[PDB]
Design an enzyme around this catalytic site. Structure first.
Site, PDB file in Angstrom:
ATOM      1  N   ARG A 261       0.859  -1.179   0.000  1.00 37.52           N
ATOM      2  CA  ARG A 261       0.000   0.000   0.000  1.00 37.52           C
ATOM      3  C   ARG A 261       0.897   1.230   0.000  1.00 37.52           C
ATOM      4  O   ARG A 261       2.104   1.120   0.189  1.00 37.52           O
ATOM      5  CB  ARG A 261      -0.857   0.035   1.270  1.00 37.52           C
TER       6      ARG A 261
ATOM      7  N   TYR B   9      -4.981   5.353  -3.205  1.00 40.74           N
ATOM      8  CA  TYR B   9      -3.732   6.125  -3.171  1.00 40.74           C
ATOM      9  C   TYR B   9      -2.959   5.978  -4.483  1.00 40.74           C
ATOM     10  O   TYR B   9      -3.065   4.945  -5.167  1.00 40.74           O
ATOM     11  CB  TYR B   9      -2.858   5.707  -1.984  1.00 40.74           C
TER      12      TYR B   9
ATOM     13  N   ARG C 270     -13.838   4.782  -2.773  1.00 41.88           N
ATOM     14  CA  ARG C 270     -12.624   5.189  -3.470  1.00 41.88           C
ATOM     15  C   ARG C 270     -12.625   4.504  -4.827  1.00 41.88           C
ATOM     16  O   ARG C 270     -12.133   3.372  -4.982  1.00 41.88           O
ATOM     17  CB  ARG C 270     -11.382   4.835  -2.655  1.00 41.88           C
TER      18      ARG C 270
ATOM     19  N   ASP D 285      -3.464  -0.496   8.672  1.00 39.58           N
ATOM     20  CA  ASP D 285      -2.549   0.610   8.948  1.00 39.58           C
ATOM     21  C   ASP D 285      -1.819   0.216  10.216  1.00 39.58           C
ATOM     22  O   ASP D 285      -2.256  -0.695  10.936  1.00 39.58           O
ATOM     23  CB  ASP D 285      -3.296   1.913   9.250  1.00 39.58           C
TER      24      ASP D 285
ATOM     25  N   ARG E 223      -5.874  16.589   0.997  1.00 34.63           N
ATOM     26  CA  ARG E 223      -7.095  15.867   1.331  1.00 34.63           C
ATOM     27  C   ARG E 223      -7.609  16.584   2.582  1.00 34.63           C
ATOM     28  O   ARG E 223      -6.818  17.134   3.348  1.00 34.63           O
ATOM     29  CB  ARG E 223      -6.723  14.417   1.670  1.00 34.63           C
TER      30      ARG E 223
ATOM     31  N   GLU F  30      -3.396  14.744   4.248  1.00 32.76           N
ATOM     32  CA  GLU F  30      -2.297  14.316   3.389  1.00 32.76           C
ATOM     33  C   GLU F  30      -2.218  15.300   2.222  1.00 32.76           C
ATOM     34  O   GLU F  30      -3.221  15.590   1.567  1.00 32.76           O
ATOM     35  CB  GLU F  30      -2.561  12.902   2.874  1.00 32.76           C
TER      36      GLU F  30
HETATM   37  C1  LIG Z   1       0.053   7.138   9.464  1.00 34.17           C
HETATM   38  C2  LIG Z   1      -1.227   6.493   8.971  1.00 34.17           C
HETATM   39  O1  LIG Z   1      -1.953   5.895   9.767  1.00 34.17           O
HETATM   40  N1  LIG Z   1      -1.539   6.654   7.688  1.00 34.17           N
HETATM   41  C3  LIG Z   1      -2.736   6.044   7.131  1.00 34.17           C
HETATM   42  C4  LIG Z   1      -3.975   6.992   7.204  1.00 34.17           C
HETATM   43  O2  LIG Z   1      -4.503   7.123   5.879  1.00 34.17           O
HETATM   44  C5  LIG Z   1      -4.984   5.818   5.577  1.00 34.17           C
HETATM   45  C6  LIG Z   1      -6.129   5.858   4.556  1.00 34.17           C
HETATM   46  O3  LIG Z   1      -6.184   4.972   3.669  1.00 34.17           O
HETATM   47  O4  LIG Z   1      -7.007   6.742   4.659  1.00 34.17           O
HETATM   48  C7  LIG Z   1      -3.785   4.997   5.064  1.00 34.17           C
HETATM   49  C8  LIG Z   1      -2.493   5.599   5.668  1.00 34.17           C
HETATM   50  O5  LIG Z   1      -1.418   4.661   5.614  1.00 34.17           O
HETATM   51  O6  LIG Z   1      -5.504   5.284   6.817  1.00 34.17           O
HETATM   52  C9  LIG Z   1      -5.021   6.121   7.896  1.00 34.17           C
HETATM   53  C10 LIG Z   1      -6.188   6.935   8.474  1.00 34.17           C
HETATM   54  O7  LIG Z   1      -6.814   7.683   7.439  1.00 34.17           O
HETATM   55  C11 LIG Z   1      -5.718   7.886   9.577  1.00 34.17           C
HETATM   56  O8  LIG Z   1      -5.096   9.019   8.991  1.00 34.17           O
END
Ligand SMILES: CC(=O)N[C@H]1[C@H]2O[C@@](C(=O)O)(C[C@@H]1O)O[C@@H]2[C@H](O)CO
EC number: 4.2.2.15
Length: 679
Positions: free
Chosen positions: A213, A633, A593, A238, A531, A515
C-alpha cells in the site's frame, strides 16, 4: 460424462439483458450434470449492470430461482461464484473484489477468468488474469450434479423464473468447459494471457510481504526512476501491525524493476508471506505488539543528486490512532534527546536519554550508564550487543497468536521486550543514499521538533519537493499533517537535508488526515493540494518558500469523498497547450474510493501578485477505467520520455469489504496525447 472439453464457444456477442442459450450445444447434457470440472472464459463487458453472470447452469422454472450455479463479475471489478440449490440444501459462495477491470487506455478490454471445482480435493478455486484469487474448502463437496431440476446452460445471465437475471452485456471471447480439474499452474498460465499495467512489488518477491500500500514514484535527474511502498505483512491494516518500507528502481524508463530492498525495517516480528483472513471476524484482527514503518516519501536533491526516504516510525504496538501525546524527546543541557524508560521502572517513568554517540544517560544523576545504541538504535551493554527473541504470528481460528521463537535479533529501543523503551508516540525517520539505493545512511530520527502537545505528526505520502527558482532555490520540503495545534504542516531544509525545520500551515486542531503534495509555480512560489475531512480537495499557496501558507480554498470542480483519499500532484517539465502544467491523480467518486482520474491543470498568470498571482485551469480529465472500478492512493511521475507514470492502488482501500487483497498496486504509463483526449 467424457473426459476433457465438454463444450467450447467463440466470439459470442451478447446484447445486454438477452443472454445466450447454449442448450443446443452437443455437450449441454454433460454440462448440465457435471460432478466437478473447470470453466475458463475470456470476456469483454460493455455493460454497467451491477452483477453480470458470465456463465450459468441451473433451473429456470417457477419457484426454483435459488437453484443454479454461475460465475459472475460486478461493475466494480469483483468476481465470484454462487453454487445453490436453495439455502436449506446448499449455498456455496466464493469471490474476491477488484479482480478484473473494464476499460484500459480508453477501450474495453478482455479479461480471462477460471473456476476450478476439484472433487478429489474438495476445493473450489477462482482465477483471473494470471492470479489465484480465492479458495473455498468444503467437506460436503457439491457441483452442478447436485442442483435439482437443471434445465439450461446460459451465457451472459442466470435464468430465474423464466427471466434473465444478473444481465451481462458485451462479448464472450471464448469459453471452454472441462469435466476434469486442471492444475493451478495451467490456470495461472491460461488466465495470464490478459494483463494490464505491471507490478513493481508483488506477493512472492524478496520483501516476503503478501500486501502493499501507499505508493511513491519519482524520476531522478539521472533518468533512473525509483519507487517505494509500504510492505504490509499482516494484511492491509494501517499501523499497529508489522510493516516495512520496500524500495525498487528502474534504469530503463520504468519498463523493468530491480529486486526490491527494505531500506526501513524492524526485526522484532518476522517478515513472512501470510494469507490474512477476509471473513467478517478475522479481517478486523491486526498484529498487536510489532514496531513498524508506514507511509513513504521520496525526494531528490538535484544539486547533490542525493535521494532521501522518509516514513513514519511506529514503536511496538503503536499507530496514529493510539500514539501517546508528546514529542518523545526530553530537553537536557538545552538540547533535545530521545528519552527512554528502563523496563523495571514505573509505567510512565522515562528517566534516561540517548545523547551524543548513542550513549544512554541517567537523567537524575546526569551520569552515563553502561548502555548505548548504534546508528540503528540497537542496544549495547558494555560494548556487547543485546538481543531478544523474535516473534511469529499465526491464526488459531479467529485469534491471532503472537509468540516468541528461538531466533535472536538485536534488541532495539522500539521493541516491546527491550530493556530500554522509547516513548510510545510516532516518530519521523529518514535515510539518505548517494548511490541510488545501493546503500543507505544510518537511521536519522528527525522529529525532535514534534510539538509536545501533539498526538501524532506524520508525513503526507508520495514525494517531497525541491524549489528550483527564486530566493529559496534549493530548499527541500516534505508535507506533514498532525493532531495538535495544526493539521497541515511541512518540514524543510536549507542545508541539503542535514537539518530540518517544522512549519505549521494552519491552526486546525481536529487532526484530520490532511495528506498533501507540493507543486511549484513558475516564479518559485508553491501551491499545496491536500485531502481534507470535508467534501473537497483544498489548495493553499506560499510566496515565501513554504514558511507561511494561505487559508484553504476548495479545488472547484474535482469531486471527492467526505473522508477523502490521498492525492498525487506533480509538475510537468514541458508546457501543455503552451502553458506551464501540473498533473493531478485522485479517485473522483463522492462515495467509495473509485473512478480514478488524471487531471491536467494549466497554470495561468492572472495579472495579480502574491498569493493571487496564479490560477490553475483544470482543463482535461482522463478516466483510468469505468466509474465503479476501485482507485485509491497513487503517485505520478514524469518519465524520461514524454510519458507520465502512475503507481496506484487499484481497489477501494477504505472499504471494509476490500481489505487484504494481493497484487493491487499497479504501474501504468500515459502520454500527454492520451491524457488530453487527443489519443
Ligand atoms: C500514518 C497512517 O496511519 N496513515 C494512514 C492513514 O490514511 C490511511 C487511509 O487509507 O485513509 C492509510 C495511511 O497509511 O488510513 C489512515 C487513516 O486515514 C488515519 O489518517
Amino acid at each position: 460424462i467424457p473426459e476433457g472439453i465438454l463444450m467450447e464457444k467463440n466470439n459470442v456477442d451478447i446484447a445486454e439483458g438477452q443472454g445466450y442459450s447454449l442448450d443446443q450445444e452437443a455437450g449441454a447434457k454433460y454440462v448440465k450434470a457435471m460432478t466437478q470440472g473447470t470453466i475458463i472464459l475470456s470476456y469483454k463487458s460493455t455493460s454497467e449492470n451491477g452483477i453480470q453472470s458470465l456463465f450459468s447452469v441451473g433451473n429456470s422454472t417457477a419457484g426454483n430461482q435459488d437453484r443454479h450455479f454461475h460465475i459472475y463479475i460486478t461493475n466494480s471489478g469483483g468476481i465470484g461464484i454462487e453454487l445453490r440449490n436453495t439455502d436449506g440444501v446448499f449455498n456455496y459462495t466464493l469471490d474476491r473484489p477488484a479482480s478484473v477491470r473494464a476499460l484500459y487506455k480508453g477501450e474495453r478490454v478482455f479479461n480471462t477468468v477460471a473456476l476450478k471445482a476439484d472433487a478429489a480435493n474438495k476445493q473450489c478455486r477462482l482465477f483471473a488474469n494470471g492470479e489465484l484469487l480465492a479458495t473455498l474448502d468444503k467437506d460436503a463437496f457439491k457441483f452442478i450434479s447436485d442442483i435439482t431440476g437443471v434445465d439450461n446452460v446460459t451465457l451472459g445471465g442466470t435464468k430465474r423464473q423464466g427471466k434473465i437475471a444478473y444481465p451481462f452485456g458485451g462479448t464472450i471471447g471464448d469459453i471452454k468447459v472441462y469435466s476434469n480439474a486442471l492444475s493451478d499452474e495451467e490456470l495461472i498460465q491460461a488466465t495470464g494471457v490478459t494483463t494490464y499495467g505491471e507490478n513493481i512489488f508483488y506477493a512472492g518477491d524478496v520483501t516476503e510481504s503478501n500486501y502493499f500500500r501507499i505508493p511513491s514514484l519519482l524520476t531522478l535527474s539521472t533518468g533512473t526512476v525509483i519507487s517505494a511502498a509500504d510492505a504490509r505483512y499482516g494484511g492491509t491494516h494501517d499501523s499497529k501491525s508489522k510493516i516495512n518500507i520496500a524500495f525498487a528502481k528502474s534504469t530503463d524508463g520504468g519498463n523493468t524493476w530491480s529486486e526490491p530492498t527494505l531500506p526501513l525495517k524492524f526485526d522484532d516480528y518476522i517478515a513472512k508471506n501470510i494469507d490474512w483472513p477476509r471473513d467478517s471476524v478475522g479481517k478486523n484482527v491486526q498484529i498487536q505488539g510489532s514496531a513498524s514503518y508506514i507511509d513513504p516519501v521520496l525526494l531528490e536533491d538535484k544539486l547533490t543528486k542525493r535521494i532521501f526516504l522518509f516514513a513514519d516510525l511506529m514503536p511496538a504496538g503503536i499507530g496514529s490512532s493510539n500514539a501517546s501525546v508528546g514529542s518523545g524527546f526530553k530537553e537536557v543541557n538545552g538540547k533535545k534527546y530521545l528519552k527512554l524508560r528502563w523496563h523495571k521502572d514505573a509505567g510512565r517513568a522515562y528517566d534516561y536519554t540517548i545523547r551524543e554517540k548513542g550513549v544512554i544517560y541517567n537523567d537524575a544523576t546526569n551520569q552515563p550508564t553502561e548502555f548505548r545504541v548504534d546508528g540503528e538504535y540497537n542496544l549495547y551493554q558494555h560494548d556487547t550487543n543485546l538481543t531478544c527473541k523474535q516473534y511469529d504470528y499465526n491464526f488459531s481460528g479467529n485469534n491471532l497468536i503472537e509468540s516468541k521463537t528461538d531466533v535472536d535479533v538485536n534488541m532495539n529501543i522500539f521493541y516491546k521486550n527491550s530493556v530500554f523503551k522509547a516513548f510510545p508516540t510516532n516518530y519521523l525517520a529518514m535515510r539518505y543514499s548517494d548511490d541510488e539505493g545501493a546503500s543507505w545512511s544510518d537511521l536519522d530520527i528527525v522529529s525532535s521538533f514534534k510539538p509536545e502537545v501533539s498526538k501524532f505528526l506524520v508525513v503526507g505520502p508520495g514525494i517531497g519537493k525541491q524549489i528550483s527558482t527564486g530566493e529559496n532555490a534549493g530548499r527541500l520540503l516534505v508535507p506533514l499533517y498532525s493532531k495538535s495545534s495544526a493539521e497541515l504542516g511541512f518540514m524543510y531544509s536549507d542545508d541539503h537535508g542535514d537539518n530540518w525545520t517544522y512549519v505549521e500551515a494552519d491552526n486546525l486542531t481536529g487532526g484530520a488526515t490532511a495528506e498533501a503534495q507540493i507543486v511549484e509555480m513558475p516564479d518559485g512560489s508553491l501551491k499545496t493540494y491536500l485531502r481534507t475531512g470535508s467534501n473537497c480537495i483544498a489548495e493553499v499557496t506560499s510566496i515565501d518558500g513554504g514558511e507561511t501558507w494561505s487559508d484553504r480554498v476548495p479545488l472547484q470542480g474535482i469531486s471527492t469523498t467526505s473522508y477523502g483519499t490521498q492525492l498525487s500532484v506533480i509538475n510537468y517539465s514541458q508546457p501543455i497547450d503552451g502553458k506551464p502544467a501540473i498533473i493531478l491523480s485522485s479517485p473522483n467518486a463522492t462515495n467509495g474510493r473509485k473512478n480514478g482520474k488524471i487531471w491536467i491543470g494549466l497554470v495561468n498568470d492572472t495579472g495579480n501578485t502574491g498569493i493571487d498571482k496564479y490560477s490553475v485551469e483544470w482543463k482535461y480529465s482522463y478516466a483510468v477505467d469505468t466509474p465503479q472500478m476501485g482507485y485509491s492512493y497513487s503517485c505520478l511521475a514524469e518519465l524520461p520520455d514524454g510519458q507520465v507514470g502512475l503507481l496506484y492502488e487499484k481497489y477501494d482501500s477504505w472499504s471494509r469489504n476490500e481489505l487484504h487483497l494481493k497484487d493491487i498496486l499497479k504501474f501504468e504509463k500515459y502520454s500527454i496525447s492520451e491524457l488530453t483526449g487527443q489519443a
